[PDB]
């Protein structure tokens, strides 16, 4: 399902780590404008014990970076697809997670969506899902490779109240696909909480590619907590998967006396701003 919500103040990341404690520095970079519309995208592939084909997972365009946020138990979302046309006619990149791994790879796969949905994928009845990877079915001419530590260090606080929220920003400025991230598990059910949180870079890799296509892959062998409705025209519907589109904007960031960004004021938003 799909719906619309408000971004509030979120999606602010360090553009570079020149330590400037107590400096009101301003930069004109790609950012998520304050109070911007963010579209809840959702995937619903589960129904009792029958097949119930999906036809879900619509197309998600990618333009000038993207801000993604989610709250997942362990590995609900494990796949990232970055490549035009998602076919064997244009170069593509895939970020695939694991228990403790990452499968960042540049190639030209025709198809890579074979999650092998479990007929017994009912989480309330069983929670077994192993070795259902089924990727890189076809590869024509693929050379660039990379493996490192995974991206999301999910923490368990011995209860479900610790609704950890993961945020990431993907922009493609002459390679070096920065994956700025920040995990704030202070959330208790609020959607995009008021406050402020900065994002710190994790990795990057230069290739050079006109990626305009975005997609995510789920842990479909164990799929649940996916409701469906007719959410449209500024409504709400449980998705656990946010997305927002960045724009080139001027921001003025206030660095703390320690070094972190306490808060930032946007430009071209309000006359006071």
């Amino acid at each position: 399902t799909q719906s619309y919500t408000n971004s509030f103040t979120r999606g602010v990341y360090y553009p570079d780590k020149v330590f400037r404690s107590s400096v009101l520095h301003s930069t004109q970079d790609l950012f998520l404008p304050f109070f911007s519309n963010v579209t809840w995208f959702h995937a619903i592939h589960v129904s009792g014990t029958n097949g119930t084909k999906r036809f879900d997972n619509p197309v998600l365009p990618f333009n000038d970076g993207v801000y993604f946020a989610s709250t997942e138990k362990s590995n609900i979302i494990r796949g990232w697809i970055f490549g035009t046309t998602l076919d064997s006619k244009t170069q593509s990149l895939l970020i695939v997670n694991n228990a403790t791994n990452v499968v960042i790879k540049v190639c030209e796969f025709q198809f890579c969506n074979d999650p092998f949905l479990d007929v017994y994928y009912h989480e309330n009845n069983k929670s077994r899902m192993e070795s259902e990877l089924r990727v890189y079915s076809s590869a024509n001419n693929c050379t660039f490779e990379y493996v490192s530590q995974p991206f999301l260090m999910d923490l368990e606080g011995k209860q479900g109240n610790f609704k950890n929220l993961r945020e990431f920003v993907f922009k493609n400025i002459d390679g070096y696909f920065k994956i700025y991230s920040k995990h704030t598990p202070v959330n208790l059910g609020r959607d995009l909480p008021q406050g402020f949180s900065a994002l710190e870079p994790l990795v990057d890799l230069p290739i050079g590619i006109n990626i305009t296509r975005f997609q995510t892959l789920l842990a479909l062998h164990r799929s649940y907590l996916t409701p469906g409705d007719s959410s449209s025209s500024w409504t709400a519907g449980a998705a656990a998967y946010y997305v927002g589109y960045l724009q080139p904007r001027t921001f003025l960031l206030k660095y703390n006396e320690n070094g972190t960004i306490t808060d930032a004021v946007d430009c071209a938003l309000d006359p006071l701003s």
Partner: protein
């Protein structure tokens, strides 16, 4: 120096500024990440099953470094043939990507790894581009690639269909056809095998013993840099005006221990004026504070040409322990006297010089703001003058200047 700046052979009383004293760096350092971490270059060289020339072992180099100073003790390195790229200037270069192929050849095939040549072997097995930049290293391999019976484990194509484009592979089993009989599969008369035995023996002399040669393909086209060199390392000096060359930094200053609280990932340091002041070195993962090298406008204090030739120097705003000390700077050539007089040559905060016989020298001292006077104010005491003095002072004021009509 005063005579040189103020163009005249007579210098009058007054403090004069002539130049600026500037400490110079005493040596140069450079430091990049810890060692080269894990460049897999050794795995390519330290091996036992090198791919032959019939199919080279192409490896992508984007997780390695350009440290061309640690790979030399893994082979004899008899031949160090290099293309237009300078072997000496390899560490500084940041190659976007390096494409290396490992293969084993013989003595007569050493010249086959070369652009713009003619012959047989490289026209069937390994084709090089015309502008093949990089380096190739050749060394003897009779220690491993020798059999008393025959080492027929490395093969090579010899009768491929036709010439191939640079860096092209034609690994495919086929019945070689050359003549008027298109062999239908028997591969008999006028049909010889494209591959040929490529064995080695130790009895053979120079030029026939097996050799292992590797190649380097570079690209100096303007692109994002991936493979970079650590520029070896230098000892990290401290508390001394030097030329620091940390990661992406080129400046001079004094490196001191830092009490800052750099959060784990860090690049540089900054201030309100957008200047670098705090850096960290990956060799130690510790924060260093950078202070601009000591400077300050030197000044000359003179009692006038028509009184003496001795002068006092006033290195300004510098603790010149790096002789008297003042808030404005340190005075050399003038001894500080504890007396007080109306000062005729201002220096700095309260300090003024003068030429006195106290055998005459220059003395600096604290200004005497005036003769001390205490009035006798009381409840019913008044002072009324009984005399006057008609004093004629003088006042001078400009009223106009020279009109100009350029």
């Amino acid at each position: 120096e005063t005579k040189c700046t103020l163009k005249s052979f007579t210098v009058e009383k007054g403090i004069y500024q002539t130049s600026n004293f500037r400490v110079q760096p005493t040596e140069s350092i450079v430091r990049f990440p810890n060692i080269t971490n894990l460049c897999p270059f050794h795995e390519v060289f330290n091996a036992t099953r090198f791919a032959s020339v019939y199919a080279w072992n192409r490896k992508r180099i984007s997780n390695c470094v350009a440290d061309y100073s640690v790979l030399y003790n893994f082979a004899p390195f008899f031949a160090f043939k290099c293309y237009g790229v300078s072997p000496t200037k390899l560490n500084d270069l940041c190659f976007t990507n390096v494409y290396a192929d490992s293969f084993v050849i013989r003595g007569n095939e050493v010249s086959q790894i070369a652009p713009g040549q003619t012959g047989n072997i490289a026209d069937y097995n390994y084709k090089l581009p015309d502008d093949f930049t990089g380096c190739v290293i050749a060394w003897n391999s009779n220690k491993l690639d020798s059999k008393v019976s025959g080492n027929y484990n490395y093969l090579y194509r010899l009768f491929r269909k036709s010439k191939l484009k640079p860096f092209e592979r034609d690994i495919s089993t086929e019945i070689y056809q050359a003549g008027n009989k298109p062999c239908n599969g028997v591969a008999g008369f006028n049909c010889y095998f494209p591959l040929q035995s490529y064995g080695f023996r130790p009895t053979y002399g120079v030029g026939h013993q097996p050799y292992r040669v590797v190649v380097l393909s570079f690209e100096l086209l303007h692109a994002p840099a991936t493979v970079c060199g650590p520029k070896k390392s230098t000892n990290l000096v401290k508390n001394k005006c030097v030329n620091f060359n940390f990661n992406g930094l080129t400046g001079t200053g004094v490196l001191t221990e830092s009490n800052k609280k750099f959060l784990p990932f860090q690049q540089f340091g900054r201030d309100i004026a957008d200047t670098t002041d705090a850096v960290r070195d990956p060799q130690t993962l510790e924060i260093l504070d950078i202070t601009p090298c000591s400077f300050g406008g030197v000044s000359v204090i003179t009692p006038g040409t028509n009184t003496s030739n001795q002068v006092a120097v006033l290195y300004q705003g510098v603790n010149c322990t790096e002789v008297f000390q003042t808030r404005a700077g340190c005075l050399i050539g003038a001894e500080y006297v504890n007396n007080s007089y109306e000062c005729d040559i201002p220096i700095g905060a309260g300090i003024c010089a003068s030429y006195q016989t106290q055998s005459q020298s220059i003395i600096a001292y604290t200004m005497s703001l005036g003769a001390e006077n205490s009035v006798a104010y009381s409840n019913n005491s008044i002072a009324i003058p009984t005399n006057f003095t008609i004093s004629v002072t003088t006042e001078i004021l400009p009223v106009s200047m020279t009109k100009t009509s350029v």
